[PDB]
Amino acid sequence: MILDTDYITEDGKPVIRIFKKENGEFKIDYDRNFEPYIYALLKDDSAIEDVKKITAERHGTTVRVVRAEKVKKKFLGRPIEVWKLYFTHPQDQPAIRDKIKEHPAVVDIYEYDIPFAKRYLIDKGLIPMEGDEELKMLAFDIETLYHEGEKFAEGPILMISYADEEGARVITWRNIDLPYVDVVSTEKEMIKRFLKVVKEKDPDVLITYNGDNFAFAYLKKRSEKLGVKFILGREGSEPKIQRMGDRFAVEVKGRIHFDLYPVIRRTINLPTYTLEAVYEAIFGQPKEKVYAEEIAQAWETGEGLERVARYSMEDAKVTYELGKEFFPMEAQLSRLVGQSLWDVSRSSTGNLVEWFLLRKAYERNELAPNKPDERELARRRESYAGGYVKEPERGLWENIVYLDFRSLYPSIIITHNVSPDTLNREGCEEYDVAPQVGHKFCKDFPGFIPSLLGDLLEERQKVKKKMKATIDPIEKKLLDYRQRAIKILANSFYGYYGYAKARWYCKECAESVTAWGRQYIETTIREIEEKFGFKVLYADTDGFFATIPGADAETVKKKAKEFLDYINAKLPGLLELEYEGFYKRGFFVTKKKYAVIDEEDKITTRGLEIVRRDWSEIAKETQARVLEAILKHGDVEEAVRIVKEVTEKLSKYEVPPEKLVIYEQITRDLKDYKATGPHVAVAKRLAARGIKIRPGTVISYIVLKGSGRIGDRAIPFDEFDPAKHKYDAEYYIENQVLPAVERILRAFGYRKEDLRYQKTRQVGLGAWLKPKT
Numbered sequence: 215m216i217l218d219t220d221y222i223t224e225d226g227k228p229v230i231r232i233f234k235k236e237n238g239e240f241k242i243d244y245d246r247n248f249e250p251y252i253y254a255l256l257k258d259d260s261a262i263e264d265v266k267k268i269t270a271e272r273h274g275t276t277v278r279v280v281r282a283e284k285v286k287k288k289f290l291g292r293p294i295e296v297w298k299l300y301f302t303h304p305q306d307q308p309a310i311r312d313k314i315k316e317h318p319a320v321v322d323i324y325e326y327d328i329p330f331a332k333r334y335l336i337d338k339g340l341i342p343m344e345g346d347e348e349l350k351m352l353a354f355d356i357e358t359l360y361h362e363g364e365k366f367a368e369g370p371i372l373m374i375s376y377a378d379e380e381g382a383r384v385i386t387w388r389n390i391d392l393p394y395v396d397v398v399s400t401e402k403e404m405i406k407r408f409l410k411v412v413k414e415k416d417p418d419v420l421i422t423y424n425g426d427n428f429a430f431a432y433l434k435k436r437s438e439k440l441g442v443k444f445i446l447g448r449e450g451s452e453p454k455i456q457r458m459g460d461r462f463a464v465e466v467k468g469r470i471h472f473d474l475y476p477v478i479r480r481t482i483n484l485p486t487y488t489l490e491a492v493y494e495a496i497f498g499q500p501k502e503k504v505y506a507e508e509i510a511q512a513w514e515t516g517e518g519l520e521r522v523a524r525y526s527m528e529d530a531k532v533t534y535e536l537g538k539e540f541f542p543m544e545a546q547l548s549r550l551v552g553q554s555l556w557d558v559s560r561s562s563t564g565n566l567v568e569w570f571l572l573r574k575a576y577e578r579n580e581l582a583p584n585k586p587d588e589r590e591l592a593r594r595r596e597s598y599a600g601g602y603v604k605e606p607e608r609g610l611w612e613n614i615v616y617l618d619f620r621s622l623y624p625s626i627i628i629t630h631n632v633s634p635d636t637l638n639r640e641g642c643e644e645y646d647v648a649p650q651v652g653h654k655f656c657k658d659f660p661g662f663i664p665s666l667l668g669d670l671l672e673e674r675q676k677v678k679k680k681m682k683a684t685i686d687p688i689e690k691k692l693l694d695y696r697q698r699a700i701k702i703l704a705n706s707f708y709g710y711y712g713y714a715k716a717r718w719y720c721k722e723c724a725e726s727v728t729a730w731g732r733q734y735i736e737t738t739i740r741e742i743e744e745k746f747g748f749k750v751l752y753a754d755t756d757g758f759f760a761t762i763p764g765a766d767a768e769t770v771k772k773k774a775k776e777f778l779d780y781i782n783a784k785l786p787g788l789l790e791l792e793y794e795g796f797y798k799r800g801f802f803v804t805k806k807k808y809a810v811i812d813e814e815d816k817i818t819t820r821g822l823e824i825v826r827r828d829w830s831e832i833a834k835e836t837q838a839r840v841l842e843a844i845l846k847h848g849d850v851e852e853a854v855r856i857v858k859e860v861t862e863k864l865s866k867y868e869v870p871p872e873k874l875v876i877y878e879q880i881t882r883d884l885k886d887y888k889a890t891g892p893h894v895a896v897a898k899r900l901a902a903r904g905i906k907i908r909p910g911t912v913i914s915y916i917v918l919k920g921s922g923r924i925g926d927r928a929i930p931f932d933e934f935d936p937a938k939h940k941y942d943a944e945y946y947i948e949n950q951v952l953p954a955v956e957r958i959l960r961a962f963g964y965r966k967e968d969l970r971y972q973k974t975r976q977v978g979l980g981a982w983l984k985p986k987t
């Protein structure tokens with residue numbers, strides 16, 4: 215299977231390199247005969263004799279148009295006649311692009327900034343990550359000590375941990391006695407040992423969590439200060455830092471650097487993205503997290519060293535296991551899009567759509583529109599819209615169905631043939647009209663994009679059919695990824711239409727699709743209320759919740775399903791409502807804020823759970839028990855009672871100290887946070903122990919009863935002693951606990967004031983001590 219492609223240049227001539235894993239053997243194929251090209255639209259064919267003779271200068275060398283041929287292609291829904299201009303080198307294109315574009319007979323140029331190594335996969339019909347071939351993978355992570363008044367990576371790396379099929383290990387130059395740890399002399403010998411272990415395992419895949427921004431950069435800058443030759447690429451390469459938006463990305467030649475961070479960020483949503491918050495979500499097993507203070511404590515002192523080595527080991531093992539989860543999925547997308555997994559895993563959804571369109575465009579002989587220049591980009595970016603919402607019926611309700619459209623936006627696009635190439639066309643005989651915005655989309659001929667979508671939705675269905683028919687759970691699992699990759703791509707098309715960097719950009723398309731979305735949601739709701747006597751409790755563009763008042767669980771289920779058959783016979787084309795679930799109880803606060811409980815006693819929440827950086831167990835626990843009281847027990851008053859009890863217990867210092875640890879991933883150095891707040895005080899307590907915390911790591915502190923502002927006395931949690939230390943109850947009540955339950959309970963009629971007992975050490979600072987939203 216094809217892992218990746220690039221090119222090298224040999225005496226000014228480009229050579230495509232194709233990295234392959236076949237029958238357990240890595241190799242590199244070469245293609246010396248792949249020619250770069252662009253297209254040009256001319257006013258009169260006679261002008262090509264001028265174009266053929268245009269030259270520019272690259273480093274003293276005259277760059278020329280090597281060859282031209284006329285080709286018929288489709289563009290903008292209609293035939294176009296263009297000129298294919300061949301070159302020697304892909305880098306000749308920009309230099310000569312500017313000149314050719316100033317020729318009065320040249321209307322414009324096309325497909326001139328499509329990377330050569332990618333052009334190659336498209337044109338040759340090649341697809342990465344195909345076939346059976348198994349791949350050896352290996353995760354790694356590093357532990358570092360931080361210096362505040364310094365440059366990047368001045369502090370040494372103390373630990374390099376890795377994880378394989380064979381297990382996990384830690385390399386270090388501190389004195390530690392554990393089975394899985396190998397000890398060495400220096401940091402230099404540690405790094406060298408890591409390079410030696412990688413080079414000999416020969417992984418096809420290097421897995422990291424955030425290695426694009428931390429691990430690799432750190433490893434290079436340290437090798438640089440220490441004089442170590444940082445070779446990890448198969449063909450003798452130091453890994454190359456690459457310009458990836460605002461931040462960076464690292465490539466390793468011959469291997470695939472699978473950085474887990476962008477994948478997880480683009481997969482499942484969360485507040486703080488700790489390696490530990492992620493292993494929680496997708497596995498259900500607790501972290502065993504040791505915080506940043508405990509480990510920098512082990513660096514100077516040496517106490518708690520074996521616990522750090524366990525932690526470091528666990529970073530690796532988790533990183534590996536997380537990698538075994540996300541890889542096949544990302545291998546499917548890279549297979550579906552036609553681009554390397556390295557690219558595909560770091561791409562935005564809009565950009566994944568672009569690469570998919572480009573390749574299909576090649577197969578259909580469709581000329582691709584250019585990107586926007588600086589002026590168009592700003593003009594596109596300066597667009598906002600609103601959204602649909604049916605504001606909720608307040609309160610607690612029972613026997614709730616949840617109904618959603620099957621692929622709302624893809625359906626609209628296919629059914630109404632919504633495409634830049636079908637927009638307000640001239641002399642059109644069949645057109646649908648967009649609601650609100652009034653655009654006319656032609657149906658005389660299928661749009662380029664609509665038809666590709668059509669085929670995607672149909673392929674998904676076929677794959678799903680085969681998944682459910684397949685008894686073999688290996689093939690079953692694989693088909694399931696296949697199916698789910700189609701979903702991710704299909705559902706990206708709507709975004710892409712309004713995606714400012716998009717080649718087939720079409721704001722008119724975007725807003726039309728949004729408007730038809732509203733209409734279908736709107737008329738379906740009107741119909742469920744009038745024809746079927748339901749009460750719609752809440753509605754999004756992700757679907758709606760409804761019940762029949764005074765009907766039991768199975769009347770509602772039967773009627774909803776009867777309603778589906780009724781509207782699905784009345785909805786146009788591919789538009790189709792589905793049964794998404796049932797919930798015995800639920801309540802709805804506002805747009806995308808709600809909690810519901812299904813028949814398995816499982817609470818699903820939306821826009822409600824704690825998304826602050828500085829969180830604690832006492833807040834989470836108390837919120838959980840409120841939602842539990844309302845939804846499990848059907849008791850709103852118990853919920854209010856519980857909060858009153860919890861706040862009382864806090865007042866009287868009966869809440870166990872451990873539940874009051876505030877975990878916060880720090881956004882910069884602690885020594886320079888907002889003057890007021892617990893941060894400065896934690897920084898002094900840590901400095902006195904000779905510790906500094908790296909921005910981007912999670913600290914642990916408890917807030918104590920103090921002599922200044924409430925919240926300004928806070929200590930490291932390991933420093934806590936039940937005598938000589940009292941915690942600041944008012945801080946846990948007004949900053950932590952109340953804010954976690956105020957929104958939920960306001961929806962039921964309760965004010966902040968109703969959530970404490972009449973006299974329980976009230977300090978009237980709620981408005982100040984609350985987090986500024």
Ligand code: NA
Nearest residue numbers: 620621698701
């Ligand atoms: Na689905």
